[PDB]
Structure formats: structure tokens, C-alpha cells
A paper describes a structure:
Tyrosylprotein sulfotransferases (TPSTs) are enzymes that catalyse the transfer of a sulfonate moiety from 3′-phosphoadenosine-5′-phosphosulfate (PAPS) to the hydroxyl group of a tyrosine residue to form a tyrosine O-sulfate ester and 3′-phosphoadenosine-5′-phosphate ([name]). TPSTs are integral membrane glycoproteins located in the trans-Golgi network. In humans, two TPST isoforms, termed [name] and TPST2, have been identified. The human [name] catalytic domain comprises a single α/β motif with a five-stranded parallel β-sheet, flanked on both sides by α helices, and this structure is consistent with human TPST2 structure.
In contrast, the asymmetric unit of [name]-[name]-[name] contains four human [name] molecules, which assemble to form two dimers. In the human [name]-[name]-[name] complex, the electron density of substrate peptide binding area could not be interpreted with any part and any one conformation of [name]. We could interpret the electron density with two binding patterns of [name] each having 0.5 occupancies. In one binding pattern, four ordered residues (E−3, E−2, A−1, Y°) in the [name] are thought to constitute a productive form based on the position of Y°, whereas in the other binding pattern, four ordered residues (E−4, E−3, E−2, A−1) in the [name] are thought to constitute a nonproductive form. In the human [name]-[name]-[name] complex, the [name] forms dual binding patterns. This is because the total interaction energy of the productive form is near equal to that of the nonproductive form due to the equality of the total interaction energy at positions −1 and 0. In the productive human [name]-[name]-[name] complex, unlike the case with C4P5Y5, Y° and A−1 form some interactions with the active site of human [name]. The backbone of Y0 interacts only with the backbone of T199, whereas backbone of A−1 interacts only with the hydroxyl group of T199. In contrast, in the nonproductive human [name]-[name]-[name] complex, unlike in the case with C4P5Y5, A−1 and E−2 at the 0 and −1 position also form some interactions with the active site of [name]. However, E−3 in the [name] interacts with R102, R106 and R123 of [name] through electrostatic interactions.
Author numbering:
A (entry chain B), C (entry chain A): 64 to 338
B (entry chain H), D (entry chain F): 1002 to 1006
The structure:
């Protein structure tokens, strides 16, 4: 049984911000299934967004009878079929595709009882991650820290503004650094936010890897080698000393979302906190 | 792709 | 009521091949609704086609549980929501999007009882039409008859091959010239092929324009001003004398599909027949 | 489009 009013969970954020860890920890809950990145969801959502943004094209679709209500119904049907059928059934279905939250507000409209989790990491950590691990993302030039931080800023700002627009009952900012430093505190807050009862197995996601009602992984995903380990504070500040000095000097200008999201742009690194 | 993300 | 096994009709072919006329003639049948070009259907089909052609990307989606069966279910749900909801309900639903039949074989698999009408027109007529009326198609350079006939050739070859692959019970080649020359003869053959009872109103499509259970037109579609008129043989050879002589000399080289489809590539024009 | 087709 599935439908557009069911309680869905959408995890996202900029890649390399702990999105796989977030969904793996929730997957470890026995009544929740998220599963691996679908990939198709961001692309069809981005396609749909290109049609609605062009007022010229929007007129042509409305004249063909392909209205907002028709498109939304087709979008709903497509996304649910993917979300429901690509993994095992569960009381609480979940979806993790980082850039799906670029259409957060639109997803909130399509799915009224859906809740969102925007993963937020220090942009310098996320950018250093994708550059050092050679993670290829559309638009992100991995030779340039300046370019990647500029694209990180643009991406995270768009998702943040939408997260804020829907409000504190539909979307929740989840700070990666805080998640790893205080995993019990945050997972308890998160499940209370999602209105799902507590289960301690979310704090042992490593012991649920490849288990029935557990954490399904993809051998070709870039976060698989890290998520199989237990939750640790190891990746908080691996970025420090690796960014060039001209970029470090311009950091607040390049990435003003660092400051908005509680990261000191001139701390090398910030004091994220300690457990 | 296609890129990774 | 609607489902993936329902008897669908997909009209298509290269733009400027009499596809609007074809669908309008069927829309004049009181039991058939086709409606306006959806526009989204070819684009989502094309998007899907890119994922399945790429063997690298096909591995990743399957590793994420987004298998053919999952994708095909998602596509079925999306395409049916557009087809059913964008127009008024009818016993026999139809869809006209010219380039939807670049995924003819795939649509035949997704919709097992769907029947296909591939409209074929003399490529010199289609190309001349799109150039003289300035009808923009992606990849077609309207400043070159040579480039347009080459792209025409590639498009029609792809759709023709898929039409012949699915077989005579699933797909019917419909020659525009033969339709306009002998409209009663061909509409009778078409409705027998579609297994829909004969109704003379298909031959009076101009009297069903904008009527209930009749022909619904889009004010920004490029065939609207011609389709409001009754069937005529006036557009058979408007191209003659308008194609440059270098392209005329190279006709069989540029467009070998002309000859494959029964058109003489050096007759100006061919003897299409007389009413 | 986008183009007419
Ligand atoms: N079990 C775990 N504990 C802590 N961090 C983890 C983890 N599994 C994955 N991560 C972190 O999540 C980041 C990848 O996020 P995403 O899943 O959005 O791509 C990686 O950052 P680094 O690559 O900087 O180490 C990785 O360290
Ligand atoms: N009532 C009618 N009788 C004959 N041809 C028609 C017609 N309505 C439309 N057409 C033809 O369909 C062609 C456009 O096809 P499509 O709808 O597939 O783009 C046009 O060719 P021309 O532009 O050469 O005149 C037009 O003449
Ligand atoms: Mg689970
Ligand atoms: Mg009708």
C-alpha cells in the first residue's frame, strides 16, 4: 500500500555532507527503509523544473492540457513507483538523493505529509572531500577549490532557503559535525522530528550492513567504504592546510553560507564542538 | 553521466 | 478507468508528416480522444533511453535497485497520467507526439495492447515544410535542406525499423500522400487495424473542430491553421523547385529512406497517385 | 525549448 499522502522521508544536501551516513543510520531502524541513491529522481525533478521555469514552455503545456495538476499527478506517480519499488517495503519509506532537495518546496507540495532532512557540512570539508576523493559532480571543477566552494555555496543556499520556506515541522537542518559528535542526542531529536518511535539500532548502523530490514548498500557508490565503519569523528577537519591561501583569504566572499550555517569562514578549522 | 551526482 | 494493458494508440513520425491531421481525423471519431501534443512524453522517453543505452549507468541503477522492471513501472505510471489526464476521457485513448515513436519498441513493451501509427511523408515535403514555415526541431538546421534531409533520414529510419520490428499487427505505416489522396480508403483500413468501428465523422474532421467529443486544438501548435481546413491534396508537392540542385543531385545519397519507403528520389515530384 | 519539437 502506497499513495501521495503517505509519510515519506527525503534526505539530501550537497554531496560529501554525510548524506549516506544519515540514511544508513535511519535504514538501521527496522521500521524504516531508505535504500541506495536512485539517481533518476534528481534528473526527472530537474527536468520538470526546466519546464515550469520557462514561461514560454509553460504556456505551450497549459494549451496542450498538460497543466500543473496533470504534471504533478504524473510526477507523483513516477516518484512513488521508484521510491516504493527500488527497495524492500517498510512502514516508513525514505529517499536519499542529495540534489532532490533542490526541488524541496515542490516535493513538499507533491507529498504533503513528507518530511525533509537537509544534511549540512562545513563546505570546506565537502569540497576537500570531492576534490581529494575525485568525486565528479556536474558543474564542480575539481581542479579549483574556489570554483567548487562557489558551486557548494550556490547549491546549499538554494536547498537551505527552501528548507526554511517549508518550516521547522517539514524540514530540519542536520549538521554533520554535530551528528558525529553527538549521535545519540541528534538521532533522538531526528526520530522525534520524524514522529517515529525510538530504536537503539540506529546507533549501531555498522552491525546492520546487508541485513534483512537493515542497511542496503551499492558497491559502485562513493560513500560505501566509509559508511560500513561505525560513527566516528574522523572526517571533521581533514581539509585544513589543503586549500590555497588566496581562496582562504576570500572564503567569506566565496562562501557566505558558511557563516549563515554557523561555520567560521576564517577558523582553520572551527571549533565544531567535542563529545 | 553521466556524473556521480 | 486506466491501466498499462489498456488499448492505446500512439501516432508519430517526423514532424511535418501529417501527424496533426492524422490525430485530428481520429479525434473526429466520437469514441476516440487524442488531443494536443503533450511535449513532455518524447522528452521523458528520450531521458529514459539515455540511461538504458549507457552500460556504465545501467550497472549503477541496477546496483541501486532501480532495475528495468522498476523503471518500466515508473514510466508506465508517468506516461498514463499525462495521456489520460491531459484530455477528456474516451473509450479509445490516443497520443500524438511525433518523436515518441523513436521509443516505439519500448512503448510496445510498456503497453502490450497499444497500437502504433507511423506517419510517413516524402522527406522533401517534410523538410521543405519545416524550412518554409520555420518550424524549429532540435538538431535540424533550417538554413540547410541537406542537413534537414539527413536528419529526416536518420529519424524516419529509426522509427521505420522499430515499426517493422514490432510487426504488422502492432504498427502500421501510413503514407500521408495516400491518406490525402484516398482518405476514405485509408481511414477504413486504419480503423480496421485499430479494431474500432467505422464512423464517417473521421472524414468531416473540420466540422468537429472544438466540439464536444471532437477535435481539441492548441493555439500555439504549428499545424493548427492547416488542420482547421478540410482534407486536401494541396501539400503533396509544394517542395518541387524549392530544393537546391546540389541537394537534388545528391538525393539518393542523403536520403536512402525515400526509396525504401516507395518514393522515387529523382522524380520531381513522384507520381503519388490521383484521387 | 525549448523548440517546437
Ligand atoms: N560511519 C561514518 N562516520 C562518520 N562519517 C562518515 C561515516 N560514513 C561516511 N561518513 C562521511 O560522509 C562523507 C560523505 O558524505 P556523502 O554520503 O554525502 O557523500 C565522507 O566525508 P569524507 O569524504 O570527507 O571522509 C565520510 O567521511
Ligand atoms: N486538412 C489537411 N489536409 C491536408 N494536409 C494537412 C491538413 N492539415 C494539415 N495538413 C498537413 O500536415 C503537415 C504538417 O504535419 P504535422 O502536423 O505532422 O507537422 C502540413 O504540411 P505543409 O506544412 O507542407 O503544408 C499540412 O499541410
Ligand atoms: Mg530498516
Ligand atoms: Mg472524439
Amino acid at each position: 500500500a502506497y499513495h501521495k499522502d503517505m509519510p515519506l522521508i527525503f534526505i539530501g544536501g550537497v554531496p560529501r555532507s554525510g548524506t549516506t551516513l544519515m540514511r544508513a543510520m535511519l535504514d538501521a531502524h527496522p521500521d524504516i527503509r531508505c535504500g541506495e541513491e536512485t539517481r533518476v529522481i534528481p534528473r526527472i525533478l530537474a527536468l520538470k523544473q526546466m519546464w515550469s521555469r520557462s514561461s514560454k514552455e509553460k504556456i505551450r503545456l497549459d494549451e496542450a492540457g498538460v497543466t500543473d495538476e496533470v504534471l504533478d499527478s504524473a510526477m507523483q506517480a513516477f516518484l512513488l513507483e521508484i521510491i516504493v519499488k527500488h527497495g524492500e517495503p517498510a512502514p516508513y519509506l525514505c529517499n536519499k538523493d542529495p540534489f532532490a532537495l533542490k526541488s524541496l518546496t515542490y516535493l513538499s507540495r507533491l507529498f504533503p505529509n513528507a518530511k525533509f532532512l537537509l544534511m549540512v557540512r562545513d563546505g570546506r570539508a565537502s569540497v576537500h572531500s570531492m576534490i581529494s576523493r575525485k568525486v565528479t559532480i556536474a558543474g564542480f571543477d575539481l581542479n579549483s577549490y574556489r570554483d567548487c566552494l562557489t558551486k557548494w555555496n550556490r547549491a546549499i543556499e538554494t536547498m537551505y532557503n527552501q528548507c526554511m520556506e517549508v518550516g521547522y515541522k517539514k524540514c530540519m537542518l542536520v549538521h554533520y559535525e554535530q551528528l558525529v559528535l553527538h549521535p545519540e542526542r541528534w538521532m533522538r531529536t531526528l526520530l522525534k522530528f520524524l514522529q517515529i518511535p525510538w530504536n537503539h539500532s540506529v546507533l549501531h548502523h555498522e552491525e546492520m550492513i546487508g541485513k534483512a530490514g537493515g542497511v542496503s548498500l551499492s558497491k559502485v557508490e562513493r560513500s560505501t567504504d566509509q559508511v560500513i565503519k561505525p560513527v566516528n569523528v574522523g572526517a571533521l577537519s581533514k581539509w585544513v592546510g589543503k586549500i590555497p591561501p588566496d581562496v582562504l583569504q576570500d572564503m567569506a566572499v566565496i562562501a557566505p553560507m558558511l557563516a549563515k550555517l554557523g561555520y567560521d569562514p576564517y577558523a582553520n578549522p572551527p571549533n565544531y564542538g567535542k563529545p | 553521466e553521466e556524473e556521480a551526482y
